[PDB]
C-alpha cells in the first residue's frame, strides 16, 4: 500500500476552522509508540500536503497574481499551508518538540502576502524540503541507500 492515490485527488474562514480543528484534535499523543513502517506511510501523507501546497501556491501566486496584470486563491493556499504545518507538527516525529523555522517562514510569508519582500519567504521551501528528507531518512534510510 504505502502511498495511495491521494496525489491524484465566509466559506474560506469556515473551511480553515474545521480543517485546522479536526487535524489538531486528532493529534497522536503517544508519538513515541510509532513503528517505522507506519511512519513512512504517514510520512508520505505529509509530502502530499506539501504537493497540495505547491499546487495552491502555483495556482494562487502565478495564475492569479498576473491575472490582475492583464487586467480566493490566497486563502486557499493559506489554509493548505497551515494545514500542512499542523499535520507535520502533530503527526510527524522530527517535526514535533519544536517549531521548524523554515517551515514556519514558508507557511507565514505567503500567508501574510510591497509583496516582493514577502514573496522571497517562499524560498524557505528549500529548508522545508531538506527537513522533510531528514524526516524520511530516520528509519527508512536503509538498507539500500548509502550502499
Amino acid at each position: 500500500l504505502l502511498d495511495k492515490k491521494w496525489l491524484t485527488f465566509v466559506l474560506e474562514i469556515v473551511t480553515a476552522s474545521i480543517l485546522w480543528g479536526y487535524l489538531w484534535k486528532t493529534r497522536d499523543r503517544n508519538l513515541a509508540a510509532l513503528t517505522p513502517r507506519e511512519e513512512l506511510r504517514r510520512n508520505f501523507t505529509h509530502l502530499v500536503w506539501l504537493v497540495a501546497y505547491a499546487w495552491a501556491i502555483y495556482w494562487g501566486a502565478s495564475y492569479f497574481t498576473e491575472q490582475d496584470g492583464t487586467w480566493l486563491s490566497y486563502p486557499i493556499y493559506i489554509i493548505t499551508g497551515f494545514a500542512a504545518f499542523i499535520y507535520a507538527k502533530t503527526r510527524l516525529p522530527f517535526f514535533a518538540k519544536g517549531i521548524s523555522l523554515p517551515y514556519l517562514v514558508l507557511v507565514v510569508g505567503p500567508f501574510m502576502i510591497g509583496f516582493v519582500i514577502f514573496g522571497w519567504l517562499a524560498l524557505a521551501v528549500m529548508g522545508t524540503l531538506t527537513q522533510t528528507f531528514y524526516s524520511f531518512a530516520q528509519g527508512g534510510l536503509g538498507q539500500s541507500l548509502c550502499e
Binding site: 496525489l7 505547491a54 524540503l129
Partner: protein, 241 residues
C-alpha cells in the same frame, strides 16, 4: 521499516518525483511574483523590450532566485540545475499566462506579448557552478555570462521586430507599430522606461554598456542572494515562536 532493496529504490524514486514537483511549483510561484512585481512591465510588451532599460534591469532582478536555489541545491545534493529550474519555471508561467489570458481573455497577439528568454543565461550559470564548483568563481564568471548573453539570447526573437518602417510620416519599428496599434489601457507609451537618448552616449554603445552594467550588478545580486538562500536553507527548530 523497509521491506527490501528494490522497493526502497522505488520509494526513493517516488519521493524524488514528489519533491521535484513541490520545489518546482513553489519556485515558479514565488519567482513569478518576484519577476512581475519587480520587472514585469518590460517583459510584457515588445516595444517595452528596448536595449537600455530592458537589458540593464532584467538580468539584475532575475539572478535573484537562481542564486539562492543554486546555493541550496548544489550545496545539498550536487544538483547543478537550480538556475535552470528557476528559469524554466518562470518561462512556463509566463507562457501559459500569455497564451491563456493575454491571448485568451484579451487578444493581444503572441508576437506582441511574448516573454523574454533566459535559458542560455541559466545554462551558463549552472555549468559554471558545477565546473569549478567554487561559488565565488560562479558569482564572478557565470553571473557575467548571465548578464552578457541575455540580450544576444533574445536577439533572434526581437530582431525581426526592429525592422524600420515609415509609419504615417514618422519612423517606427515593427515593435513600435505593434504597441501603437494594439492598445494597452493600463500601459501607455510614456510609462515606457526605454532608451530615450542621452548626451553622454558615444556611438553604438547603448547595448554593450547596458549589458556590462547588468553583468556587474548581476554579480552583486548573485553574491547577495547566494547568502540569502544559504540563510533560507537552514534547519533551525524554534522552541518558542
Amino acid at each position: 521499516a523497509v521491506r527490501s532493496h528494490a522497493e526502497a529504490v522505488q520509494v526513493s524514486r517516488t519521493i524524488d518525483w514528489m519533491a521535484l514537483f513541490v520545489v518546482f511549483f513553489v519556485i515558479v510561484g514565488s519567482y513569478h511574483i518576484h519577476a512581475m512585481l519587480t520587472m514585469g512591465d518590460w517583459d510584457f510588451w515588445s516595444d517595452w523590450k528596448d536595449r537600455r532599460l530592458w537589458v540593464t534591469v532584467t538580468p539584475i532582478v532575475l539572478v535573484t532566485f537562481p542564486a539562492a536555489v543554486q546555493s541550496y541545491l548544489w550545496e545539498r545534493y550536487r544538483l547543478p540545475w537550480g538556475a535552470t529550474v528557476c528559469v524554466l519555471g518562470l518561462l512556463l508561467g509566463e507562457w501559459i499566462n500569455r497564451y491563456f489570458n493575454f491571448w485568451g481573455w484579451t487578444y493581444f497577439p503572441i508576437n506582441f506579448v511574448f516573454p523574454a528568454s533566459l535559458v542560455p543565461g541559466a545554462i551558463i550559470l549552472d555549468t559554471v557552478l558545477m565546473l569549478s564548483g567554487s561559488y565565488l568563481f560562479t558569482a564572478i564568471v557565470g553571473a557575467m555570462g548571465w548578464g552578457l548573453i541575455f540580450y544576444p539570447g533574445n536577439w533572434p526573437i526581437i530582431a525581426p521586430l526592429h525592422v524600420p518602417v515609415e509609419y504615417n510620416g514618422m519612423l517606427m519599428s515593427i515593435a513600435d507599430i505593434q504597441g501603437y496599434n494594439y492598445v494597452r489601457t493600463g500601459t501607455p507609451e510614456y510609462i515606457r522606461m526605454v532608451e530615450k537618448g542621452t548626451l553622454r552616449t558615444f556611438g553604438k554603445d547603448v547595448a554593450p554598456v547596458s549589458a556590462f552594467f547588468s553583468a556587474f550588478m548581476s554579480i552583486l545580486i548573485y553574491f547577495m542572494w547566494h547568502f540569502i538562500g544559504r540563510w533560507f536553507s537552514n534547519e533551525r527548530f524554534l522552541q518558542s515562536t
